[PDB]
Structure 1
Amino acid sequence: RKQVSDGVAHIHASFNNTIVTITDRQGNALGWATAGGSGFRGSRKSTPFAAQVAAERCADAVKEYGIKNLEVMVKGPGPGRESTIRALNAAGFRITNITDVTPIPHDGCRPPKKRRV
C-alpha cells in the first residue's frame, strides 16, 4: 500500500510484556508485534530479549511501507524499554527522536492495594 518514510514506533513496555506499534505520524497503525506473540510465553515474555525479537518482527511487519525514519515513543517501566530501540536502530531505521511518554498523574486516582506476598 501507500508509502510513508516517516513513522512513529510506540513501545508499550510493561512489566509483563512489550508491545511495539509502528504508526504513521498521524497515529494510524501500520503494523505491530508483541513479545508474547513472538514465541515467548511466561517467564520469557517479560525479558529484554523478547522485546528485541518483537521489535524485529514489527519492523518486518511494516517493510512494505518503505518507512525510513522513526520517532520512538517509550511508555512504561518494563524491561523492553531500550532493547526495542536498539532493535529498531539495528533494522536500518533512522531514529530521529526518542521520547518518554509514560503517563504520570499530578496526584490523580488511587492505585490498587499493595500485594502481601
Structure 2
Amino acid sequence: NIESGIAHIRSTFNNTIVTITDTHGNAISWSSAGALGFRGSRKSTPFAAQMAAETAAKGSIEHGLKTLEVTVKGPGSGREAAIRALQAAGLEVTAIRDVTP
C-alpha cells in the first residue's frame, strides 16, 4: 500500500511494456501489449499502449496509488497515448521524463 510512484513505459517499434513502481523502484504492477493478447502490428499501435498503460494503472490503484511520475524509453508511438491513459485511469501525472538514448 503506497501512494506515490514511477511509471516506466517502454514503447518500442514492436511492443509496449508498462511497469509501475514505488519511489524506490520496486515493481507494484505491470502490463504490456503482448500480455494484452495483441500480436504483430497491433503491439506497435497506440491502442495497445493505452490498454497496457491502463491495465497496469488499474492494478496500481488496487494497491492505492494516486500520483505518478512517468519515465519513457524507446521510439515507439505508444508513449503519447499511454501517458494520457495514466491520466484517464485517474492517476495524476507530475514530472514527465524521456530517458531515450
Cα displacement (A) at 1:63: 2.2
How many corresponding residue pairs? 101
Structure 1 residue identity aligned to 2:51: V
User: More relative contact order in 1 or in 2 (CA 8 Å, sep 6+)?
Assistant: 2
> Superposition RMSD on alpha carbons, in Å?
0.8
Q: Tell me which structure has the larger Cα radius of gyration.
A: 1
Match of 1:65 among 63, 66, 80: 63
Cα displacement (A) at 1:60: 1.7
Structure 2 residue identity aligned to 1:91: A
Match of 1:33 among 31, 35, 49: 31
Alpha-carbon distance between aligned partners in 2 of 1:12 and 1:47, rounded to the nearest angstrom: 13
More helix by share: 2
Structure 2 residue identity aligned to 1:20: V
Alignment of 1:44-55 (within 5 A): 44-55=42-53
TM-score (ref. length: structure 1): 0.83
Q: Which runs of 5+ in 2 are unaligned?
A: none
Alpha-carbon distance between aligned partners in 2 of 1:49 and 1:100, rounded to the nearest angstrom: 20
Identity %: 63
Other structure's SS at 2:42 match: coil
Alpha-carbon distance between aligned partners in 1 of 2:62 and 2:9, rounded to the nearest angstrom: 21
TM-score (ref. length: structure 2): 0.96
Q: Is residue 19 of structure 1 aligned with residue 24 of structure 2? A: no
Q: Which residue of 2 aligns with 1:98?
A: 96
Q: Which runs of 5+ in 1 are unaligned?
A: 105-117
Deviations 1:58-108 (A, max 9, x none): 112222211010000011100112110010001110101100111x2xxxx
